[PDB]
Design a protein around this ligand. Structure first.
Ligand SMILES: Nc1ncnc2c1ncn2[C@@H]1O[C@H](COP(=O)(O)OP(=O)(O)O)[C@@H](O)[C@H]1O
Ligand SMILES: Nc1ncnc2c1ncn2[C@@H]1O[C@H](COP(=O)(O)OP(=O)(O)O)[C@@H](O)[C@H]1O
Ligand SMILES: [Mg+2]
Ligand SMILES: [Mg+2]
Lengths: 199, 174, 371, 371, 185
C-alpha cells in the first residue's frame, strides 16, 4: 500500500532556496562557503542557530522574513500530510520467513506422502492433513504472488526514484521533517506573539 | 552549470554547520541545479543578517592575624553566625544546652595563638575597624591566660560527655 | 549585592535572601487549573493559580506538580513557579540579584541544561550556581566530616564527605520520599472507609501525615500494641467537619522508609543505604562517619526517627563505634540555611557562573564548573 | 571416563565435556527469587529460578550473584548453581565423572576449602582439580611462554609464565572487571535521562554494554569527536519497545579498565599492571614476555582493545622490542578450551586429587597439591 | 441527565430501570467521537426509536454514543480522574520494564460495562496511540464476558489445590472475624 501511495514528490521548493541564500552568507569564509545544497534533516537545527542577542533564531528570522517579503511560502507545512506516517521499517526477514514456510510445507507434504495406511477409525490423519496441504499451498502461493508483487513494486520504485536497494533509515528522514513542521508553526506563533507584545 | 556566489561579508557571522553537497555529487535532474535563489537577493536582507546574527567592599586589613587564620575563622563564623559577645557569654556561663562537641572542637582547631590574641587585645579601641575574624579574636582575647583557661574550658565541656560514656560501660560490666 | 537562595524542592519551594536565618518564602510547588465550567463573567478569573492561592481554591482545581523525583517534566509550569517565586513572593528583579540553586545528586544533565538556559535567558540573572543539597546540610550542621541523608518529597540521597572531600563513588540515590509516603497513606486510608482519590484530597492526606504520623522504635511491638488496645488511636477533623480516627497507620506510613517492599520497590531501606554508603568509603574515615550522621529534610521530621536510626545503625555497625545521629530541630529548612552560608562566604565570589562565561561557552559550562 | 570442565566464573558459568572444541552449557550465574505476592494457586510456583530461566522471568525476580570478585559469598546459592549445571544443563552424574575447576590467583583459602568440601561431600566426585585460569589461557593460545591478562566479570589478573615456570611474585590481581563496568554504565546512563535501579535492569545495561560498547584508541580524540558531531551515537531497543540513543558512553564504560580512578580505585590500569608484571620478572625473559601478550576473558572481547593495548605497552616498553598482542577470535571461552586441553593430556592423569587422598589428608591436600 | 434534553423526564427509581434498558439495548461506543458527532449533527442516520412500556415512542440520536463516552472521558460527569485507557496505560507503566511486552499483548476485559459493541476497537486505537509503535496491541474480549468473573469462580472453587485455602469454622472461632485479612489477599 505504501509503494502504491508513494508516487508524488517536490512540494518544498521555495524555502530551501531562501535558506541556502541566507545560509551561504552566514557560512561565507568557512568550510561551508558556496554550498550548492544542504540536508533536509538539518532543518531542525535552524532553531539552534541563535542570534547575538539570543532573542530570535534563524528559524524565527526566516519566519519573520516570510511574513514580511513573500506571504506565500508559509503554506508549506500543511502540504506535508503523510510525513508523520512514513516512519517505519519492514523488510529483509519476510523472504527468510517465506523460505522457512516453503521448506516446512514441503516437509509436511513429504511426510503426508510417506505415511502408511490408517489402522484405526480414530486415525483421521489422512483426510484432514491432505486438506491442510491443499490449504497451505494455496495460502503460500497467495503469499508468494503478493511478495512477488511486493518485490515488483519495490523494483518499480527503484526505477522511479533511480535508487538501488541500499538506502534506508527513512524513519529518521521524515521524523526531522515532521519536527520541522512543528518547529515552524511554533516560530510563526512566537513571532506573532513577539509582535503583539511590542504593540 | 555555474559556481555559487562567494560572498565576502565585513563581519564574521554565526553559521549553521551542515554537511554540504559539492557539485561533483549533484545529478542532472536534482533540485539544486534548478535553484534560482538570486531572485531572493536583497542588500537589506544581508544588512539585517549582519545586524542580527553578528560597588563591593571585600578587602580587610589584617593587623595581627595572618591570611590563613583570618580565612578559616570567618568560614566558621559564617557557619555559626552568632554575635561575638554571645559566644563569650555561653563559654563563660557553660550553657550545656547550647554547647556541643563539634562547636568546641571547631573552636579549638581554629583558635589563634595567645600572642596573637594578646596583640588583638591591645587594639580594643579600633574594634569596629578590624576584620570579622579579628573582631572575634578581640572578644576571645578579653579573657587572658589563654592555653590554661581553654584547656579548663575543654575538660569541663567534655566531662558531661565523658561521664555519659564511662558510666554506662561500667554498669554493663557490673 | 545580596544573593538569593532558592531551594526548588520536589514538594515545597523555599526561597529567600542570603544572610538570613529563616527562609522568607516557603510555599508548595503546585500549579492549579480549573476543571469546571465558569458561569460568572468577569471577577478576575485567572486561568492558573500558583502556590498558596492554589492551596486556597483547591476544591475547583486540578493541581500539578512540575517536579517528579528531582526531574522537572513540565517546563512552562516550572517557569510559572519561578516567575511567582521571584515577582510575587520575593518581589525582586532577577536581573540584579545572583541566585544559587540546589539540585539532587545523579540528576539527568538536560535538567541542568534547561535550568541554566531559563536562568540565563528568561529570568536573565547576572550569575547563578548549581550546588548539592547535602554539602549545604553539612554546612548548616557546623561540622566538616559526616554522611548526610537528605530526604525531601521526591529524592532521598546519602552523600558522605570527609574533611571537605566528597567521595562520588559512594553517593547513593533512592527515589522514595514524602510523596510516595503520601500516596501510600492514600492507599492504606481506604481500609477504614475513608476514600481519597483526587489531587485536592492529596493535600488533606499530606496534612494528616504531617500532623499525626510518627516513627515507631520497634515495628512489631507497636503493631501488637495497636492491634491489642486502642490507646495509640488519634482523631482528626476534615474541612467538611467529619472526624476520622486512625490507629496503626500513624506508624505504617513512615515505615516504608525503612522497608521499601511495602510499595513494591526492590531496594533496601535508608539505614542499609547509610551503612552501605559508609562501607563503600575508605576505611580510615569510617569512625568519623559513624559519629556524624547528619539528617536533614522534612521527611526526617518525624518524632521517632533519630532513635530508630541510631538503633538500626548500631545494629549494623560493629559494637565499638560511637553512633551519633545529628538531628537538629531546624532540619526542615537546614539546606536553605547552608545556602545562606555558601552565598555569604567571601571565597565563593570567584565561583559564580557569569553571563559572559555563558555567552562564551554556551549552556555547557554548568557540567564543567559545578560538581 | 570423559572429564568435565566447569569454569565457575563470576558472571557466566561455562561447563561441558572434555575433548570438545566449544563449551556445551554457557549460562549466567544468577539465582532469582520472587519479590511479589503470588495470587494464582499451583502452576509450578518455584521458590527459586536458576540460570537462563531467571533470565527469562526476570521482571518479577530479585537476582543474586553468588560470586563477587572471585570469592563465593553465598554458598547455598553456589550449591544451587552447581546442582543446576550438573543435573539440568549437562544432565550428568558427578559420581562417575572427573571435574576441573578454575580459580583466580590470590584467592582466600577458605573459598578453596569450601569448594573442595562441597565437591567432595555434596556432589562427591571420583576426582577433581582446581587450577589457575592463566595457565589454561596459555594452553589454549598454543604456546609455552607468555604473559596472560585474564579479565572475567570480577577479577583482572596478570600472570607471566616462562617455559612452564610461573613466577608467583609477579602475579598481579586487580578487582576490576565487567560487573564494575556494568555498575559504572548504570551510573553514567542516568546522565542522559535513563534510570536503571533494579537487579533486572542490570541485565539490560549488561546487554547494552555487550552489544554497543567498544574500546577507544585515543580517548581525548574520541571525546572530541563525540562532542563535535553525533556520528558515534547508536540506538538500542528496550524490551518494552522504548528506543534509547547513547553517545560517548559506548567508550567511557571500557575506559575504566585503563583508568580505574573513574570509579574511585587508587590502583593503576591494566596496561601498567601488565608492564609492572613484566618488569617484576627477571631481565632475560622480558623480551619473551613482550611478544606474547595473551588476552583472554569476555571483558577483552571489545573490538578496540588489542590496538589500544599494543599502543600503551609500546609507549611503556623500550622501543627496540616488538610488542605483539595475541588476540584469538575465540578468547571468550578460551580458559574452558584450556581445560579441554588439560583434561585430555596423558601426563595430567597422575595429578588428580582422588577421593582416598581427600579422606586420608582431610581438606588440606588442596593447598599442597595445587598451585 | 441527558435524556431530558429531548423532552423525556426520568426522575424516579422505577424510571432508572427503563433508562438502564435503553442503555443496554441501543447504546454503542463510537470509534471517533468528533466524526460521529459531526455525522449525527449532519444527517439523521444514527437515530433510533425505542418503545416505552406505556406505549409511547422515544427517538434518540447522539445519546447512543454520548452515554458510554464517559468511560473514556470522565470529565462529562465532573471527575478529576482520567479515562480507562490512560488508567490501563498507567497500570502497565507502573509495572516492571521486562514484562510490559506481555501485558500489551494481553489486555483482558470483563464485566457487562465492556459489553458495548464498539469498545474494543476504540480501546485498541487509544492504547496503540499511547504505546510505542513496535508493540502488538491485543485485546481479548470474549462474547461471554458478562458472567466470566462468575465462570472464573467456577474455575477456582472446582480446583483440587483450593481445598486447603478455605477459612473454616474452627479457625474463625479461634481468631475472631479477623483471620480473613491474613488468609486472603
Ligand atoms: N512534621 C512533618 N512530619 C513528617 N513529614 C513532613 C513534616 N513536615 C513536612 N514533611 C514532609 O516534607 C516534605 C517537604 O520537604 P522539603 O523541605 O520540600 O524537602 P526538599 O526541598 O528536599 O524537597 C513534604 O512533602 C512533607 O511530606
Ligand atoms: N562481546 C562482548 N563485548 C563486551 N563485553 C562482553 C562481551 N561478551 C561478554 N562480555 C562481558 O564479559 C563478561 C563475561 O566474561 P566471562 O569470562 O564469561 O565471565 P564469567 O566467566 O565470570 O561469567 C560478561 O559479564 C560481559 O559483561
Ligand atoms: Mg531540598
Ligand atoms: Mg572466567
Amino acid at each position: 500500500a505504501a509503494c502504491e501511495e508513494l508516487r508524488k514528490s517536490e512540494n518544498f521548493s521555495s524555502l530551501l532556496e531562501l535558506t541556502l541564500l541566507v545560509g551561504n552568507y552566514m557560512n561565507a569564509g568557512s568550510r561551508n562557503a558556496g554550498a550548492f545544497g544542504f540536508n533536509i534533516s538539518f532543518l531542525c537545527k535552524l532553531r539552534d542557530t541563535k542570534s547575538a542577542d539570543q532573542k530570535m533564531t534563524l528559524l524565527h528570522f526566516l519566519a519573520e522574513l516570510c511574513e514580511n517579503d513573500h506571504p506565500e511560502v508559509l503554506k508549506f507545512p500543511d502540504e506535508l500530510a503523510h510525513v508523520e506516517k512514513a516512519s517505519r521499517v519492514s523488510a529483509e526477514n519476510l523472504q527468510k520467513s517465506l523460505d522457512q514456510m516453503k521448506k516446512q510445507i514441503a516437509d509436511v507434504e513429504r511426510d503426508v506422502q510417506n505415511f502408511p495406511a490408517a489402522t484405526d477409525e480414530k486415525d483421521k490423519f489422512v483426510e484432514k492433513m491432505t486438506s491442510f496441504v491443499k490449504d497451505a499451498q494455496e495460502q503460500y502461493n497467495k503469499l508468494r504472488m503478493m511478495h512477488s508483487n511486493m518485490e515488483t513494486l519495490y523494483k518499480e520504485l527503484g526505477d522511479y526514484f533511480v535508487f538501488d536497494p541500499k538506502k534506508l533509515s527513512v524513519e529518521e528522514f521524515f521524523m526531522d521533517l515532521h519536527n520541522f513542521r512543528n518547529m515552524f508553526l511554533q516560530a510563526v506563533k512566537e513571532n506573532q506573539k513577539r509582535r503583539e507584545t511590542e504593540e | 552549470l555555474t559556481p555559487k556566489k562567494v560572498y565576502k561579508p565585513e563581519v564574521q557571522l554565526r553559521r549553521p554547520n551542515w554537511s554540504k553537497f559539492v557539485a561533483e555529487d549533484l545529478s542532472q535532474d536534482c533540485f539544486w541545479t534548478k535553484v534560482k535563489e538570486d531572485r531572493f537577493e536583497n542588500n537589506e536582507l544581508f544588512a539585517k543578517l549582519t545586524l542580527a546574527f553578528s560597588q563591593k567592599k571585600k578587602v580587610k586589613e589584617l593587623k595581627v592575624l595572618d591570611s590563613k587564620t583570618a580565612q578559616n575563622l570567618s568560614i566558621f563564623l559564617g557557619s555559626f553566625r552568632m554575635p561575638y559577645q554571645e559566644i563569650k557569654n555561653v563559654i563563660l556561663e557553660v550553657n550545656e544546652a547550647v554547647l556541643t562537641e563539634s562547636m568546641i572542637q571547631n573552636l579549638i582547631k581554629q583558635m589563634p595563638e595567645p600572642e596573637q590574641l594578646k596583640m588583638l587585645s591591645e587594639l580594643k579601641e579600633e574594634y569596629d575597624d578590624l576584620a570579622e575574624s579579628e573582631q572575634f579574636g578581640v572578644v576571645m582575647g578579653t579573657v587572658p591566660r589563654l592555653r590554661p583557661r581553654l584547656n579548663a574550658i575543654l575538660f569541663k565541656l567534655q566531662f558531661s560527655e565523658q561521664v555519659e560514656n564511662i558510666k554506662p560501660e561500667i554498669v554493663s560490666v557490673t | 549585592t545580596t544573593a538569593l537562595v532558592c531551594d526548588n524542592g520536589s514538594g515545597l519551594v523555599k526561597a529567600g535572601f542570603a544572610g538570613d536565618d529563616a527562609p522568607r518564602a516557603v510555599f508548595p510547588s503546585i500549579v492549579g487549573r480549573p476543571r469546571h465550567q465558569g458561569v460568572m463573567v468577569g471577577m478576575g478569573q485567572k486561568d492558573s493559580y500558583v502556590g498558596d492561592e492554589a492551596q486556597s481554591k483547591r476544591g475547583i482545581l486540578t493541581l500539578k506538580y512540575p517536579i517528579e523525583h528531582g526531574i522537572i517534566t513540565n517546563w512552562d509550569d516550572m517557569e510559572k513557579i519561578w516567575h511567582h517565586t521571584f515577582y510575587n513572593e520575593l518581589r525582586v528583579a532577577p536581573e540584579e540579584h545572583p541566585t544559587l540553586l540546589t539540585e539532587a545528586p545523579l540528576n539527568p544533565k538536560a535538567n541542568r541544561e534547561k535550568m541554566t538556559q531559563i536562568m540565563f535567558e528568561t529570568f536573565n540573572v547576572p550569575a547563578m550556581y548549581v550546588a548539592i543539597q547535602a554539602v549545604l546540610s553539612l554546612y548548616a550542621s557546623g561540622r566538616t566530616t559526616g554522611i548526610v541523608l537528605d530526604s525531601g518529597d521526591g529524592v532521598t540521597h546519602n552523600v558522605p564527605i570527609y574533611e571537605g572531600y566528597a567521595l562520588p563513588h559512594a553517593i547513593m540515590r533512592l527515589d522514595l520520599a514524602g510523596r510516595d509516603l503520601t500516596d501510600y497513606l492514600m492507599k492504606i486510608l481506604t481500609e477504614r472507609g475513608y476514600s481519597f482519590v483526587t489531587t485536592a484530597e492529596r493535600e488533606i492526606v499530606r496534612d494528616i501525615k504531617e500532623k499525626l504520623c510518627y516513627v515507631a522504635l520497634d515495628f512489631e511491638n507497636e503493631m501488637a500494641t495497636a492491634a491489642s488496645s486502642s490507646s495509640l488511636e488519634k482523631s482528626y477533623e476534615l474541612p467538611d467537619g467529619q472526624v476520622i480516627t486512625i490507629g496503626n497507620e500513624r506508624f505504617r506510613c513512615p515505615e516504608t522508609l525503612f522497608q521499601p517492599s511495602f510499595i513494591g520497590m526492590e531496594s533496601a531501606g535508608i539505614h542499609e543505604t547509610t551503612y552501605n554508603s559508609i562501607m563503600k568509603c575508605d576505611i580510615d574515615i569510617r569512625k568519623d562517619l559513624y559519629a556524624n550522621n547528619v539528617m536533614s529534610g522534612g521527611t526526617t521530621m518525624y518524632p521517632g526517627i533519630a532513635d530508630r536510626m541510631q538503633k538500626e545503625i548500631t545494629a549494623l555497625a560493629p559494637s565499638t563505634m560511637k553512633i551519633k545521629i545529628i538531628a537538629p530541630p531546624e532540619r526542615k529548612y537546614s539546606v536553605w540555611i547552608g545556602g545562606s552560608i555558601l552565598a555569604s562566604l567571601s571565597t565563593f565570589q570567584q565561583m559564580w557562573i557569569t553571563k559572559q562565561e555563558y555567552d562564551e561557552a554556551g549552556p555547557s559550562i554548568v557540567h564543567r564548573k559545578c560538581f
